[PDB]
């Protein structure tokens, strides 16, 4: 008889209490007899770098020059990414300069996103 409070896993009878998750991802599947099989591939392996010798810290000194907000736009990226190669080669049929026409044969597809932050 309470309908305003959120509905979460702590609410129903045994069945409900079990079925309803809590926002937590899955990593495996139930086999016969309520046995759980975990898959090493569906567990996010963190990728932490080697921080030794790094010359940057959580904050930046107050003695730094200011600048203008210039968000990176497709034109700005293209300008210094591939354009100079074109111009250099313009003085004497697009995949040679980084163009990727289709995105089935690469591990990190850009659309749809098949990878994670």
């Amino acid at each position: 008889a309470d309908r305003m409070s959120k509905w979460t896993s702590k609410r129903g009878p045994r069945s409900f209490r079990g079925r309803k998750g809590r926002g937590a991802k899955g990593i495996g599947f139930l086999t016969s007899g309520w046995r759980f099989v975990q898959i090493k591939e569906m567990v996010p392996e963190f990728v932490v770098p080697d921080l030794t010798g790094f010359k940057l810290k959580p904050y930046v000194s107050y003695l730094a020059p200011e600048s203008e907000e210039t968000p990176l736009t497709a034109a700005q990226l293209f300008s210094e990414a591939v354009a100079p190669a074109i111009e250099k080669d313009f003085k004497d049929n697009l995949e040679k300069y980084g163009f990727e026409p289709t995105q089935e044969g690469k591990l990190f597809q850009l659309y749809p996103r098949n990878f994670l932050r």
Binding site: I86, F90, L94, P101
Partner: protein
């Protein structure tokens, strides 16, 4: 408050705003246009004026169509224009007896009809009126080809019409291969209902089917901006080179 357009103008407004706005002109004209169906269940008054007996003066008269119901099962057949009459009757045909419910339904049959532009036999449910109209029209193909959308009142009939009109418009060989003379004979026999393909594709489509067709027609994978920007770069470089 008050709207800026009445309620019944909202449909016509919608036909100008969104995806419906890019539909070809002739389809919109065929959709908005309204025609009265040919009288079926009532005797139309012959003339625009008439003398009545009670007084003797010349009074105007109009014919007010009976409203008729077409259950969805008819959309799969060719009922002609016929349908159900839902209404009331006076019990003994005297006005001082109970007002009783009454429904009049057509006598339906199933039959087989041969379409020549389609060279196919269809099994269809029809009524005596549909057979008489077909005979009066000298064949099923003529009946479906010359009758307008409103008198047919059958999505099946309009689909048949779209098929036959497309077959005529394309002049495609698939009617009767291995005998082009018969092809030419059949195609030219109906040479009068020969409208261009661009108008043939849209004949009979309901509004929803039209929207879906237009969407499929225009839906397209966005062009990679890499090609666009390299094209702009090449244009600028050529301009700089020729200078």
């Amino acid at each position: 408050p008050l709207h800026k357009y009445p309620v019944w103008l909202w449909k016509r407004l919608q036909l100008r705003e969104g995806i419906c706005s890019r539909l070809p002109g002739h389809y919109l004209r065929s959709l908005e246009e309204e025609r009265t169906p040919t009288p079926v269940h009532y005797r139309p008054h012959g003339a625009k004026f008439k003398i009545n007996p009670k007084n003797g003066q010349r009074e105007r008269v109009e014919d007010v169509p009976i409203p008729i119901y077409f259950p969805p099962e008819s959309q799969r057949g060719l009922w002609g224009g016929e349908g159900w009459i839902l209404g009331q009757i006076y019990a003994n045909n005297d006005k001082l007896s109970k007002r009783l419910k009454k429904v009049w339904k057509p006598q339906l049959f199933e039959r087989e009809f041969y379409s020549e532009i389609l060279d196919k036999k269809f099994t269809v449910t029809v009524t005596m009126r549909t057979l008489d109209l077909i005979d009066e029209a000298y064949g099923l193909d003529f009946y479906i080809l010359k009758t307008p959308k409103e008198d047919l009142c059958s999505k099946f009939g309009m689909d048949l019409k779209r098929g036959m009109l497309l077959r005529l418009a394309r002049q495609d060989p698939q009617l009767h291969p291995e005998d082009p003379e018969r092809r030419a004979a059949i195609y030219d026999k109906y040479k009068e209902f020969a409208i261009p393909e661009e108008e043939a594709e849209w004949v009979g489509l309901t509004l929803e089917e039209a929207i879906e067709k237009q969407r499929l027609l225009e839906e397209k994978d966005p062009v990679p901006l890499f090609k666009i920007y390299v094209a702009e770069l090449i244009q600028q470089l050529q301009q700089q080179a020729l200078s």
